[PDB]
Amino acid sequence: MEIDELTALGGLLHDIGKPVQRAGLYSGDHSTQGARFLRDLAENTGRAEYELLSLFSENDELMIRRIKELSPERFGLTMEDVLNALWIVYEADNLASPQASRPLYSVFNPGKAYPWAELDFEKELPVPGDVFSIRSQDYRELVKRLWEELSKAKLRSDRLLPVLEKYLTFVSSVTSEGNIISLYDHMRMTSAIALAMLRAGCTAEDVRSGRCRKEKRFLLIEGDFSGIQDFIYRVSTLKYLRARSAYLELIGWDVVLEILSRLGLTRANVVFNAGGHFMIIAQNTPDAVKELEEIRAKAVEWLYREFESDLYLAIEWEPVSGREFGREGGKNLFAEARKRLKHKLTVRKLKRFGEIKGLFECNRLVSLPKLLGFGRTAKNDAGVLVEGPFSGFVPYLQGGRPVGEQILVKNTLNPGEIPESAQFVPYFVADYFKKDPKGGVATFEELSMASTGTRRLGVMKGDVDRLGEFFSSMDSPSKLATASRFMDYFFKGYIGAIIEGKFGYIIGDVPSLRDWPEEPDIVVVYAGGDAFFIVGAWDQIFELAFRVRRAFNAYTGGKLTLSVGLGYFDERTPIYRMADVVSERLDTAKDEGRNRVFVVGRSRPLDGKHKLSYEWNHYEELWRTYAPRIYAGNGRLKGKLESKKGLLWKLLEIRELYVRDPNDVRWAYLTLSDLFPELVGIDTKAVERKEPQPVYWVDGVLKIVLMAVR
Amino acid sequence: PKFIAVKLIPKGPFRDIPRADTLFGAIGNAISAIHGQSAVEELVDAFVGGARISSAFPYSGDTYYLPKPLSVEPALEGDEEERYTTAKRLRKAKYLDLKNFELALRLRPFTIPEEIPYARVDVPRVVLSSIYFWEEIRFREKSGVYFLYSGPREVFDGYIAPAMRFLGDLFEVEFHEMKIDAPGSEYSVTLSNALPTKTPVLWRLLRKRMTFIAEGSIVKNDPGGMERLELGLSHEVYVYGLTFPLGVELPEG
Ligand SMILES: [Mn+2]
Ligand SMILES: [Mn+2]
């Protein structure tokens, strides 16, 4: 052990008492009882580091003596080293941020609460539901799986963080009403802030006087990529497109892990890393700002040489004090510090590649379905398949051994069989794809060929509404850490499940053209942060928009909303054009309000009264109303309409005369006519409300049914 | 200051809205076809000597549009839900009308054009099979494109006017006086895409291979520069990258 590992593991295990008190294993307050749990665990297996680590959950007389009994020399530490570590972690607990049965209340909707479960993307969708007490039996089962895993883990934050995340994700950090903070998130942020305070040269006297709290000894480091949809879409195939997306994820991790390495920080110091956007809490030493300047410049110089002006990385950092991690006198200082950091990033994005003074004077990615992750090695190394700005990336396959100081491991919190010396880095990626008759990812052509009726490629781009404002309303680092993680995990964790046809009772009846296949004709280009780009059989993509919107409504408390752009294209349309159209349509969905979907391209009056988008509920109602009367399912019209298909086409012609001029009363004169009663009359509540006639809306259903039946 | 506005009245659609480099190119080519390279050299001399042309901007009837100065992107804060929503649409706006441009130069509140007088229609065609697109620019009624000239009238009458008439033979040409009120300032916006001599204040890169600063970029006393090069053609070729500066008030940031 050295002071850095001790302060990092101490921050992590400070509040491990909470789960053991709540399970009624011992007697006493969470403080005393957490000390007992680790002391007891230390004696079992025989790892004395846990008895050292047990000191964190507890005049300074008794303390100095208890530390002295645990011989500090044994671990290569001083007595005065450990006192700092404890005092540092004590403040770190306060900065990061009562019945013993209260569950975790949802950051999305504090009125609703999570059933107790372990974080598992293959089990069931987290749904904030009715407030239920958690049984003192459930905590006991948690604590015993927890004890069994700490017993086998290497006592390195990269081996501790994962087991704390599995089991303490759906646990209230404090058992108050409307507590939003996951215990895991409070633990990782305390460790983050604690290790930062250490590196800031802060010491016990400083913590005692507040000359750490009331002084700018921290850095908020934000990194946003710029030129992404230029870097990913706007190529020259679906294979290559997934390779670019995967490449941008590795490039990002290479910068983040480089920063953590050089500042002497842990993965816990990563507040978030989603959609090419990362945030890190760090020390404010002259040494660290110099290390960041070197990193910022070497990363940009590499991006410029490798991809020209296409992809830029804007990196900024702001000096920040303990005060600013928390609310002070009704002012959210943390949001106020984030806002000032946001501003520096916007300025840096307007000084693109200004870190090069020389400014004003595709086979490796093709080769890029049996791998478990990548090793972060030297650039000059055998097996390196792709290179990032700082390091080479060797693919780690099931049959083979991993290679490098860091191993990036895909879609697990279990180190697997990697060497003890190698840093475990779990990364989640939404990588669902329809498997070909060959084991390879299907093509635009094969996806389009699998559609009901018309052969078109389905393309949907989705994006959460007003996320920025939601994150701005997070009081503390640990709160922000829960919001960002829960948000990212919906897209990275559960979209695969939603595609597989899970969460049927949660989702319910959605607009649909066919029975949901067991292996859907869907391929994810990207899903992370608060956004997705997905392609597939047009009719399956149409349905997946409604599935994903409802799963997200349930996953939030019905308190956050999506907007979606949908596109149905000839399979030969180049990617760049498909991306730009679904982007224009997503943007439109947001201009016209949010919580709406661009279902299909539509004619309309340009009188500023007629939106192209639909409100999700308005389209879902329209579909329930009209679809069953005209559509039998699985590519088939109703029998009554087999000879009367033209009636559907005549309505779309009637609707065009409403679009020619929605004031002229000819579409009335024109209108079994008991098939569409809501469209015959001249709706008057609409005329007064200054809103469109029901006839305006019907195309959204009819055009989709006609594509299905052709 | 006051400028000559060269109005291109379009006789059908346009491939793109031309920027200062392409406009100077076309004009240098036209002057070579009329007066020989002796006149091209006098043109370059006039421009190196202080004469400038802007990139082309849309107009609609009596409405001249100019590029949004990048100065106001980081200033926009100068309701909660309303402000983030407008700020995203101001941030996306490429053009302001003259009145709202002159206000943006002074960091005073300003509004955006609701509808822009051109639509990008990219038309698809099948090639034997695949689909390709040709960007076309469709002009609303009595709408089109204009650029500004600053410098002596004799250089305008002697080179720019005759060249622009030649280039018209897709468009006809007419010119009017235009006044832009701009604050006195250490800092200026470029109304032309430029090859900078100094690192600029705020900018968007423009890849063409040359690295240009886009229209709307902010510089401090940067005249830009012209480049001559040899491409194996009969004549040496000049690349226009001079700044067309108007004073611009910057926020302290
Ligand atoms: Mn987004
Ligand atoms: Mn969003």
PDB file of N, CA, C and O in Angstrom, chain B residues 194-218:
ATOM      1  N   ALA B 194     -10.862  33.854 -45.505  1.00  0.00           N
ATOM      2  CA  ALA B 194      -9.503  34.442 -45.464  1.00  0.00           C
ATOM      3  C   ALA B 194      -8.444  33.387 -45.122  1.00  0.00           C
ATOM      4  O   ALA B 194      -8.758  32.413 -44.407  1.00  0.00           O
ATOM      5  N   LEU B 195      -7.234  33.598 -45.649  1.00  0.00           N
ATOM      6  CA  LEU B 195      -5.969  32.939 -45.237  1.00  0.00           C
ATOM      7  C   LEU B 195      -5.282  33.867 -44.245  1.00  0.00           C
ATOM      8  O   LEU B 195      -4.695  34.869 -44.641  1.00  0.00           O
ATOM      9  N   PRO B 196      -5.380  33.601 -42.925  1.00  0.00           N
ATOM     10  CA  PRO B 196      -4.882  34.546 -41.925  1.00  0.00           C
ATOM     11  C   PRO B 196      -3.351  34.571 -41.850  1.00  0.00           C
ATOM     12  O   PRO B 196      -2.734  33.593 -42.216  1.00  0.00           O
ATOM     13  N   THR B 197      -2.791  35.699 -41.412  1.00  0.00           N
ATOM     14  CA  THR B 197      -1.336  35.899 -41.186  1.00  0.00           C
ATOM     15  C   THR B 197      -1.035  35.721 -39.693  1.00  0.00           C
ATOM     16  O   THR B 197       0.051  35.217 -39.383  1.00  0.00           O
ATOM     17  N   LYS B 198      -1.966  36.136 -38.823  1.00  0.00           N
ATOM     18  CA  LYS B 198      -1.941  35.940 -37.344  1.00  0.00           C
ATOM     19  C   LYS B 198      -2.964  34.859 -36.966  1.00  0.00           C
ATOM     20  O   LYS B 198      -3.918  34.648 -37.748  1.00  0.00           O
ATOM     21  N   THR B 199      -2.798  34.211 -35.807  1.00  0.00           N
ATOM     22  CA  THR B 199      -3.841  33.328 -35.217  1.00  0.00           C
ATOM     23  C   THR B 199      -5.006  34.237 -34.838  1.00  0.00           C
ATOM     24  O   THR B 199      -4.792  35.294 -34.247  1.00  0.00           O
ATOM     25  N   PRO B 200      -6.256  33.902 -35.232  1.00  0.00           N
ATOM     26  CA  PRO B 200      -7.399  34.793 -35.030  1.00  0.00           C
ATOM     27  C   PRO B 200      -8.035  34.584 -33.647  1.00  0.00           C
ATOM     28  O   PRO B 200      -7.541  33.761 -32.914  1.00  0.00           O
ATOM     29  N   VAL B 201      -9.097  35.329 -33.328  1.00  0.00           N
ATOM     30  CA  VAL B 201      -9.714  35.365 -31.966  1.00  0.00           C
ATOM     31  C   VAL B 201     -10.726  34.222 -31.860  1.00  0.00           C
ATOM     32  O   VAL B 201     -10.530  33.344 -31.001  1.00  0.00           O
ATOM     33  N   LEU B 202     -11.766  34.260 -32.699  1.00  0.00           N
ATOM     34  CA  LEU B 202     -12.789  33.192 -32.866  1.00  0.00           C
ATOM     35  C   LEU B 202     -12.883  32.856 -34.361  1.00  0.00           C
ATOM     36  O   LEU B 202     -12.721  33.772 -35.181  1.00  0.00           O
ATOM     37  N   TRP B 203     -13.127  31.597 -34.721  1.00  0.00           N
ATOM     38  CA  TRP B 203     -13.098  31.164 -36.141  1.00  0.00           C
ATOM     39  C   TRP B 203     -13.748  29.794 -36.333  1.00  0.00           C
ATOM     40  O   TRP B 203     -13.790  29.004 -35.371  1.00  0.00           O
ATOM     41  N   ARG B 204     -14.238  29.559 -37.552  1.00  0.00           N
ATOM     42  CA  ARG B 204     -14.583  28.228 -38.104  1.00  0.00           C
ATOM     43  C   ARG B 204     -13.610  27.937 -39.248  1.00  0.00           C
ATOM     44  O   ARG B 204     -13.476  28.776 -40.155  1.00  0.00           O
ATOM     45  N   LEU B 205     -12.942  26.792 -39.196  1.00  0.00           N
ATOM     46  CA  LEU B 205     -12.067  26.314 -40.290  1.00  0.00           C
ATOM     47  C   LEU B 205     -12.932  25.941 -41.491  1.00  0.00           C
ATOM     48  O   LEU B 205     -14.075  25.491 -41.303  1.00  0.00           O
ATOM     49  N   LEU B 206     -12.367  26.135 -42.678  1.00  0.00           N
ATOM     50  CA  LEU B 206     -13.012  25.894 -43.984  1.00  0.00           C
ATOM     51  C   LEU B 206     -11.981  25.203 -44.880  1.00  0.00           C
ATOM     52  O   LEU B 206     -11.041  25.889 -45.342  1.00  0.00           O
ATOM     53  N   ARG B 207     -12.127  23.884 -45.055  1.00  0.00           N
ATOM     54  CA  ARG B 207     -11.179  23.000 -45.789  1.00  0.00           C
ATOM     55  C   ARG B 207     -11.473  23.068 -47.296  1.00  0.00           C
ATOM     56  O   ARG B 207     -12.642  22.861 -47.681  1.00  0.00           O
ATOM     57  N   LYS B 208     -10.451  23.355 -48.111  1.00  0.00           N
ATOM     58  CA  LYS B 208     -10.540  23.408 -49.598  1.00  0.00           C
ATOM     59  C   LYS B 208      -9.202  22.967 -50.200  1.00  0.00           C
ATOM     60  O   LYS B 208      -9.247  22.284 -51.241  1.00  0.00           O
ATOM     61  N   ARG B 209      -4.594  21.713 -51.208  1.00  0.00           N
ATOM     62  CA  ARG B 209      -5.671  21.970 -50.212  1.00  0.00           C
ATOM     63  C   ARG B 209      -5.268  23.147 -49.316  1.00  0.00           C
ATOM     64  O   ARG B 209      -4.154  23.105 -48.754  1.00  0.00           O
ATOM     65  N   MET B 210      -6.149  24.147 -49.196  1.00  0.00           N
ATOM     66  CA  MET B 210      -5.948  25.399 -48.414  1.00  0.00           C
ATOM     67  C   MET B 210      -6.784  25.351 -47.127  1.00  0.00           C
ATOM     68  O   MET B 210      -7.923  24.842 -47.182  1.00  0.00           O
ATOM     69  N   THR B 211      -6.255  25.887 -46.021  1.00  0.00           N
ATOM     70  CA  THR B 211      -7.004  26.059 -44.745  1.00  0.00           C
ATOM     71  C   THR B 211      -7.447  27.522 -44.618  1.00  0.00           C
ATOM     72  O   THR B 211      -6.601  28.389 -44.316  1.00  0.00           O
ATOM     73  N   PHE B 212      -8.740  27.770 -44.846  1.00  0.00           N
ATOM     74  CA  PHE B 212      -9.389  29.102 -44.756  1.00  0.00           C
ATOM     75  C   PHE B 212     -10.122  29.263 -43.417  1.00  0.00           C
ATOM     76  O   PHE B 212     -10.665  28.290 -42.858  1.00  0.00           O
ATOM     77  N   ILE B 213     -10.118  30.500 -42.932  1.00  0.00           N
ATOM     78  CA  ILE B 213     -11.021  31.056 -41.884  1.00  0.00           C
ATOM     79  C   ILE B 213     -12.351  31.399 -42.572  1.00  0.00           C
ATOM     80  O   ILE B 213     -12.316  32.088 -43.596  1.00  0.00           O
ATOM     81  N   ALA B 214     -13.484  30.936 -42.045  1.00  0.00           N
ATOM     82  CA  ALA B 214     -14.825  31.181 -42.628  1.00  0.00           C
ATOM     83  C   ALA B 214     -15.251  32.642 -42.428  1.00  0.00           C
ATOM     84  O   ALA B 214     -14.694  33.327 -41.554  1.00  0.00           O
ATOM     85  N   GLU B 215     -16.237  33.073 -43.218  1.00  0.00           N
ATOM     86  CA  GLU B 215     -16.980  34.350 -43.058  1.00  0.00           C
ATOM     87  C   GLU B 215     -17.660  34.337 -41.684  1.00  0.00           C
ATOM     88  O   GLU B 215     -18.289  33.330 -41.359  1.00  0.00           O
ATOM     89  N   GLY B 216     -17.517  35.411 -40.909  1.00  0.00           N
ATOM     90  CA  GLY B 216     -18.044  35.520 -39.540  1.00  0.00           C
ATOM     91  C   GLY B 216     -16.943  35.367 -38.507  1.00  0.00           C
ATOM     92  O   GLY B 216     -17.181  35.725 -37.347  1.00  0.00           O
ATOM     93  N   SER B 217     -15.779  34.842 -38.898  1.00  0.00           N
ATOM     94  CA  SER B 217     -14.597  34.707 -38.011  1.00  0.00           C
ATOM     95  C   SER B 217     -14.196  36.093 -37.493  1.00  0.00           C
ATOM     96  O   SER B 217     -14.548  37.089 -38.150  1.00  0.00           O
ATOM     97  N   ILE B 218     -13.506  36.153 -36.352  1.00  0.00           N
ATOM     98  CA  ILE B 218     -13.082  37.425 -35.695  1.00  0.00           C
ATOM     99  C   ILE B 218     -11.554  37.460 -35.654  1.00  0.00           C
ATOM    100  O   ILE B 218     -10.952  36.466 -35.197  1.00  0.00           O
TER     101      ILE B 218
END
